[PDB]
Structures are given as structure tokens and as C-alpha cells.
Design a protein around this ligand. Structure first.
Ligand SMILES: Cc1cc2nc3c(=O)[nH]c(=O)nc-3n(C[C@H](O)[C@H](O)[C@H](O)COP(=O)(O)O)c2cc1C
Ligand SMILES: CC(=O)[C@H]1CC[C@H]2[C@@H]3CCC4=CC(=O)CC[C@]4(C)[C@H]3CC[C@]12C
Length: 364
């Protein structure tokens, strides 16, 4: 019955009854205008409430933070009230839910920015990737990213404050935890990576400078709420949507994790590979990470149940977040526990659209 995946784990302020977590999954089904979570999104999360922990789809800390049409926010009264219904649904089913908070920075498009203006980043370099907009019929469509404007020095306190306010908002909205999105090429990662950061002020150059913004954010949100409410997702090894981690990625990663550990936060979520591939982590590196962080460590990235049991049993990580298996299997915990087959995935309905391919996938 898989030896440890179905055992409890204390995760900061809450207790997970198992180690099968639901990874954050952008599904781009919110209401526009307003970027408002929907009853349908509430149903989808409720279906998945047996997860050890649900991590929400990435959610905007501000309107500026928006980079995808259909991604929800957590900055407006309308958004807060909608999220309250979703977390109540999950709690009604005895689940736990964390909100993943992002600023997309240069992975964005001017047509969805305030005033229709260019999006912001550490430097004025195009992301050279695609984001998702909606066409005149409300259907998801790919679009090249807009070239960003470099944040001015005196704009950085505002960014930190947006993260702080969004965490305040998450508390009022009834989330159990927050997850800072410091991975996959979005704004915090844009500062972290030399490839996307050519600043010559104290937010660029050395690893200390590059990690300055994310650590400022971590301190602000710990002070706003509590360290045992804060998780962070990083992707510090490999390349993610054209953003790599520099020529000293392993040393820089360990620096960051040591700094994070100083804040005593609830967890560290390691996204190990991009959807395209990535070189696998070495056991030695996992050991170096493990010895530097004293909260929960969550592993993610094309994990199998077997891999998750291997590494939890090795004491290298405490939980695993599954993404696409959770899209297709609301009761993934029960399936894994019973070694039942999984529903087939339907990737064409991962983004945008409605119930089909969303609340679609049956339970046992
Ligand atoms: C449709 C889709 C949406 C995603 N959305 C997010 C997101 O909002 N935040 C994030 O950190 N990662 C995101 N990802 C990465 C997932 O959280 C997960 O780390 C990659 O799915 C995990 O692997 P697996 O799906 O093979 O289990 C997404 C991946 C897919 C396929
Ligand atoms: C190349 C393309 O279609 C884009 C449009 C939507 C984007 C996905 C949007 C959600 C997302 C958030 C993440 O944190 C990891 C990258 C992903 C998973 C994105 C990868 C690139 C995709 C799939």
C-alpha cells in the first residue's frame, strides 16, 4: 500500500494526513473582467479535497501581476469574496489549501496590463516565450510576450508591498497557507537568474543581490502573517521557460535555501524540471538541500508514486506534488492507495474553456 505516502505530516500551521499533494495548476478559467474565481473552480477544488495539501493555481498579487487571461487574482474585494467560497468548500471536505501567489513580470502581454502598457521585470529583455490570451469568443490562444520595462529602484518597495497585501488578503480569504511563486521564469525568478537580470543596483549582480527581492518578500509576508504560514516554490536547477539559473546554479541554490531557512518558514517546494526536460537531481544535491532546510520539503516534476516513495523513504523529501495526475484524478490519493488505474489525461482542455476537461474526470 505504498509505505509512507499515506502517513501524516506537519506542514507549518496545519497537518496533512498524507503526502500526496496537488501541485499548483494554472487552468485559466476565471471570469473576466475582474479575474474572479468561479463556482466551477470551487467545485474542481472541492473534488480534490482529499489531497494532503491542495496548492492553488498561480494567483495574482496585483493587477500589474497579471500575465495570462483567465488567471485569478487575490487583490480585489470581488476576488477575496470568491476565494472565501472556494476555501470554505475545501474545508467542508476536511481539506487544506494553500494559495500560490505570483507576479508574472515579463511573461505577460501589454493588452492585459493596466493602461495597456508594457509589463515590468528586472531588466528590459523580452521573455521570448508565449503567454495565453483570450480571443473575441473567450477561447484561450497563444501570444508572444511583450518586451518589459525595467523596474525603477523606487518601484521595488511597491512590489514587496503587493506581496504583503496579497498574503493579508489570503488570510482573510481563509487559505491555510501561501506559496510564493519564486520559480519558472516569473518575476521573483527573473531577479534571481543572471540570464534575465542585468541590473547594476543592489538587485543585480551577485547572488546576494539577485536573491534580495525574494528575501525581502519572504520577510514581509512572514511579518504580515506568520512564518509557519509561508511556503515558497523555487526551480533553481535547470532551465525553465528560457530562464536558466546561472553558471553557479548549485552554489546559488544553496545560498538561497540557507537564507530561507533563517526565516523558519513552513516549506520549500522544489520544482525539479520544466515541462520539457531537465537533468535529474543528484542524490548528493538532495542531501545538501535537506541539511540546509528545517521545514517540509516538497518534491515535484514528473514524479511517479515509486519515485516519491523512494525519496521520502530515503528521508530526502517529505511530500510530493503531482500536477497532471491531479488534473485527471480528483481522488488521486485513493487511486494511489489502492493501486487503481488512472483516468487518461486530456491536455487540450488544460487551459481555458469550461467544465469539460475540468470537473469532468470521475472519481472511483
Ligand atoms: C496545465 C499546467 C499548469 C501549471 N501551472 C502552474 C502554476 O500555476 N504554478 C507552478 O508553480 N507550476 C505550474 N505548473 C507546474 C506544475 O505545478 C507541476 O510542478 C509540473 O505539472 C509537475 O509535474 P507533473 O505534472 O508531471 O506531476 C503547471 C503545469 C501544467 C501542466
Ligand atoms: C507554450 C504554451 O502554450 C504556454 C501557454 C500557457 C503556459 C503554461 C501556463 C501555466 C504555467 C505556470 C507555471 O508555473 C509553469 C509553466 C506553465 C505550465 C506554462 C508553460 C507554457 C504554456 C503551456
Amino acid at each position: 500500500s505504498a509505505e509512507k505516502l499515506f502517513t501524516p505530516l506537519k506542514v507549518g500551521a496545519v497537518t496533512a494526513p498524507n503526502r500526496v499533494f496537488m501541485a499548483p495548476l494554472t487552468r485559466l478559467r476565471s471570469i473576466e473582467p475582474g479575474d474572479i474565481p468561479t463556482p466551477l473552480m470551487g467545485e474542481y477544488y472541492r473534488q480534490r479535497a482529499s489531497a494532503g495539501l491542495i496548492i492553488s493555481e498561480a494567483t495574482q498579487i496585483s493587477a500589474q501581476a497579471k500575465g495570462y487571461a483567465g488567471a485569478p487574482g487575490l487583490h480585489s474585494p470581488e476576488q477575496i469574496a470568491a476565494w472565501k467560497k472556494i476555501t470554505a468548500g475545501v474545508h467542508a471536505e476536511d481539506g487544506r489549501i494553500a494559495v500560490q501567489l505570483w507576479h508574472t513580470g515579463r511573461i505577460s502581454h501589454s493588452s492585459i496590463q493596466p493602461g495597456g502598457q508594457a509589463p515590468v521585470s528586472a531588466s528590459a529583455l523580452n521573455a521570448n516565450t508565449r503567454t495565453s490570451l483570450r480571443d473575441e469568443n473567450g477561447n484561450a490562444i497563444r501570444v508572444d510576450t511583450t518586451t518589459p520595462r525595467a523596474l525603477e529602484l523606487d518601484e521595488i518597495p511597491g512590489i514587496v508591498n503587493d506581496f504583503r497585501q496579497a498574503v493579508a488578503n489570503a488570510r482573510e480569504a481563509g487559505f491555510d497557507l501561501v506559496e510564493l511563486h519564486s520559480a519558472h521564469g516569473y518575476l521573483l525568478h527573473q531577479f534571481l537568474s543572471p540570464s534575465s537580470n542585468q541590473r547594476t543596483d543592489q538587485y543585480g549582480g551577485s547572488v546576494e543581490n539577485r536573491a534580495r527581492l525574494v528575501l525581502e518578500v519572504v520577510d514581509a509576508v512572514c511579518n504580515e502573517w506568520s512564518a509557519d504560514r509561508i511556503g515558497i516554490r523555487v526551480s533553481p536547477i535547470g532551465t525553465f521557460q528560457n530562464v536558466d539559473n546561472g553558471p553557479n546554479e548549485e552554489a546559488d541554490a544553496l545560498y538561497l535555501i540557507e537564507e530561507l531557512a533563517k526565516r523558519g518558514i513552513a516549506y520549500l517546494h522544489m520544482s525539479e524540471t520544466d515541462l520539457a526536460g531537465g537533468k535529474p537531481y543528484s542524490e548528493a544535491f538532495r542531501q545538501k538541500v535537506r541539511e540546509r532546510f528545517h521545514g517540509v520539503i516538497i518534491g515535484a516534476g514528473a514524479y511517479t508514486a515509486e519515485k516519491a516513495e523512494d525519496l521520502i523513504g530515503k528521508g530526502l523529501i517529505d511530500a510530493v506534488a503531482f500536477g497532471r495526475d491531479y488534473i485527471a484524478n480528483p481522488d488521486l490519493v485513493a487511486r494511489l492507495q489502492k493501486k487503481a488505474e488512472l483516468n487518461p489525461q486530456r491536455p487540450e482542455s488544460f487551459y481555458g474553456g469550461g467544465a469539460e476537461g475540468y470537473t469532468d474526470y470521475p472519481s472511483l
